[PDB]
Write a structure and sequence with these properties.
By secondary structure, this protein is an alpha+beta fold. The chain has helices at 3-11, 14-26, 35-53, 68-82, 111-122, 149-168, 172-176; strands at 60-62, 93-95, 100-107, 128-133, 138-140. The structure holds the ligand C[C@@H](N1CN([C@H]2c3ccccc3CSc3ccccc32)n2ccc(=O)c(O)c2C1=O)C(F)(F)F and manganese (II) ion (MN) (2 copies). One of its GO terms (cellular component) is host cell nucleus.
């Protein structure tokens, strides 16, 4: 039982922890062993939820946080209703306002590297990419950041607080040296 596991459980909302645990076990992975991956999945999950809470009431369908089958079910309904092409890879949200899927990224390296990595993987000129770093940078497809500055600033503040909280516990370096 690691210090990182206990930190995660006190740092993140219980529903977030439970969803992250479920995600990991869906692919056979142990949150008690892959503890940096645990923290990362919780973080990404919270970002996705804060992101969908930006903007107006019915704006985003949340794909992330569901099991594989239901996530693709929702993607299928979105495609077979809006006519948007079916992504090769599961995204994180759908924007009913802009009519595009969103892939959220949270990285401990420069937003540039990670954006290039995700863009080359999906390759769809369709799925919108939005990367946040733990240093407060962000990078988004076609310089279009979807949300208000205020809703994005909230996410960046939260990411930096997670980083400080890891640091005060001497877990940050292991977390960063694991991505
Ligand atoms: C399963 C879905 N994944 C994979 N993987 C994911 C995950 C989930 C469970 C077990 C292992 C891993 C790899 S590590 C990681 C780290 C942080 C956040 C999410 C995750 N992703 C990494 C970055 C993302 O932005 C993202 O959306 C995912 C994601 O959604 C998929 F798309 F493949 F179906
Ligand atoms: Mn995802
Ligand atoms: Mn993502």
């Amino acid at each position: 039982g690691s210090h990182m596991e206990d930190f995660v459980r006190q740092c993140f909302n219980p529903m977030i922890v439970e969803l992250a645990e479920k995600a990991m076990k869906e692919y056979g992975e142990d949150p008690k062993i892959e503890t940096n991956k645990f923290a990362a999945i919780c973080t990404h999950l919270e970002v996705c939820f804060m992101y969908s809470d930006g903007g107006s009431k019915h704006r985003f369908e949340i794909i992330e946080g569901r099991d594989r089958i239901m996530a693709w079910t929702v993607v299928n309904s979105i495609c077979n209703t809006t006519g948007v092409e079916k992504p090769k890879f599961l995204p994180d949200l759908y924007d009913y306002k802009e009519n595009r899927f969103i892939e959220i990224g949270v990285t401990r390296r420069e937003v540039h590297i990670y954006y290039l990595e995700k863009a080359n993987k999906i390759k769809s000129e369709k799925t919108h990419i939005h990367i946040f770093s733990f240093t407060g940078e962000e990078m988004a497809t076609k310089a279009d950041y979807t949300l208000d500055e205020e809703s994005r600033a909230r996410i960046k503040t939260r990411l930096f607080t997670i980083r400080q909280e890891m640091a005060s516990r001497s877990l940050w370096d292991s977390f960063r040296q694991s991505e």
